[PDB]
Ligand binder design. Structure first.
Ligand code: NAD
Ligand code: NAD
Ligand code: 0WE
Ligand code: 0WE
Lengths: 258, 256
């Protein structure tokens, strides 16, 4: 048996075999976790049920994180099979496409700001509120952030604020839930070409420039972050809570190349 | 006055204890011309009174929850200050219920929505509205708290809003830099005002004094001076920065 052996983990945001959530699910199953999955729309229902079936999982439940009721119904359905379980992965992020186009202060709008912060930052607590009573002692919660939280990156715009809010969310959640044996962490992942990479401007050239100046000298993959994710949600990470772990290849800690 | 020749809009003054009151009169002392805003009909009188005490005639209605109110405010300001040299963003709010006890139990979607709407978005929304009017060498300022960067009990979602605000500072600074605009934040230490009203320690909290390097909590005058400096040409080399004005409380750990 590998680590995460006796663990039951819920994985959100699996929209593709390219999704970060797929890479994470693969690693967690390889390490022997019993998984459950969610999907937003009925367009995804077909795909997620198969990825879940490949990974050996009967549990595949709809959930749009915009709605408090949707979240409650999902954890009620999950309760029928998983009365208690050992945490979940928050791999959801959205902001109206047009918000990420050009100059930040031009693009940004009150509604763009709301949706971005609601879906990418609050969604994480909403979900933790709904299943708090089901979490086992020693359980672990994980989310995914980007360097845009810490720095001003062109055309990332409002998402950077949502991610900043999210990283603070990890901190407060970890602090609130610590005492009851629950750890909350985040992975600040490097740039990967997934469903969130389109229709982003200059994404090809951005990865090329990013792979030249990142110390490890390659762009990170969904396997690398899946591995860290599995570790963060495992008892090997029992001493880590409220932390924003950079699975960056070392990009963020360098400056001025070449 | 190192702030002389500058016209700066100060918001969020509602009391002599108010943090913007300290900033305004520090800004006044250094020869700046000031304009003010008030959120409510309730505040109008007090903001008019202090505006008069600082030699200002420009006092305008502005609720930053409404885009129309902001645009009407800057439209009304345009008639007197067609162009000016930036503003001070001393505004924050979450429903009171949100700032009490366990964060996860306290927080709601609506409480999160308002917290972020009023405390973070309003800052850029205001910049958005007056971007046309901002002179080269203009400077924007906002006020934050350590709860952005660490988990403070009973600060709760305000910490998330503040974190968003501090990120907003960097993005605003990066976007508006090329047009000669600077955008920074003062992360102030705890002060007795607001308004902070109905907050649990609080005086227990106010005993940071024992743990804070300078052996006291920071004052409205300390923040006022720093804010004046940050909005002057003296701080021409500083942009997108979160300057901690809390007597070095943030940089210390385990002082008994
Ligand atoms: N470059 C990257 O791709 C990158 C880097 C760092 C962090 N991340 C983060 O990782 C997470 C996954 O992003 P990705 O790009 O790897 O794959 P992705 O594009 O599939 O992620 C988006 C996910 O959001 C879900 N979704 C959208 N809105 C929803 C909502 N309100 N409720 C429920 N489901 C909804 C979809 O199922 C989808 O899987 C995001 O939070 C993203 O911010 C990605
Ligand atoms: N006092 C502290 O302990 C402390 C510490 C660090 C930072 N700050 C920050 O300083 C700023 C002002 O706080 P203060 O201590 O001066 O108390 P205060 O109560 O005087 O300031 C809050 C201000 O928000 C304004 N306001 C509320 N909702 C509004 C809206 N939608 N539109 C327009 N105006 C609205 C009020 O008029 C008021 O002037 C806040 O942003 C707070 O986050 C305060
Ligand atoms: C990296 C990187 C990403 C990936 N990433 C870390 C993200 O957080 C992406 C977030 C995202 C949120 N909402 C939407 C989209 C992407 C695409 C299309 C859409 O309609 N909505 O996106 C960027 C956008 C601009 C700059 C860099 C990046
Ligand atoms: C310091 C400090 C403050 C002050 N501060 C830095 C803040 O950033 C905001 C305080 C605040 C924001 N919104 C409201 C209230 C206080 C009271 C009543 C109300 O209706 N809304 O508040 C705290 C709350 C808990 C712990 C510390 C603090």
């Amino acid at each position: 048996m590998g680590f995460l052996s006796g663990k039951r983990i819920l994985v959100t945001g699996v929209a593709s075999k390219l999704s970060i959530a797929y890479g994470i699910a693969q690693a967690m199953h390889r390490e022997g976790a019993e998984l459950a999955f969610t999907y937003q729309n009925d367009k995804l229902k077909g795909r997620v049920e198969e990825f879940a079936a490949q990974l050996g999982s009967d549990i595949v439940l709809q959930c749009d994180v915009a709605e408090d009721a949707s979240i409650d119904t999902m954890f009620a359905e999950l309760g029928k099979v998983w009365p208690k379980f050992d945490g979940f992965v928050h791999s959801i992020g959205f902001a109206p496409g047009d918000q990420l186009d050009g100059d930040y202060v031009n693009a940004v709008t009150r509604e763009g700001f709301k949706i971005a912060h609601d879906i990418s930052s609050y969604s994480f607590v909403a979900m933790a509120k709904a299943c708090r009573s089901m979490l086992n002692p020693g359980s672990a919660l994980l989310t995914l952030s980007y360097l845009g939280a810490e720095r001003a990156i062109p055309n990332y715009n409002v998402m950077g604020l949502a991610k900043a809010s999210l990283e603070a969310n990890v901190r407060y959640m970890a602090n609130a839930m610590g005492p009851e044996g629950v750890r909350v962490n985040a992975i600040s992942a490097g740039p990967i070409r997934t469903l969130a990479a389109s229709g982003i401007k200059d994404f090809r050239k951005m990865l090329a420039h990013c792979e030249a100046v990142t110390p490890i000298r390659r762009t990170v993959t969904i396997e690398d972050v899946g591995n860290s994710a599995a570790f963060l949600c495992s008892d090997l990470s029992a001493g880590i809570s409220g932390e924003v772990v950079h699975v960056d290849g070392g990009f963020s800690i360098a400056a001025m190349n070449e």
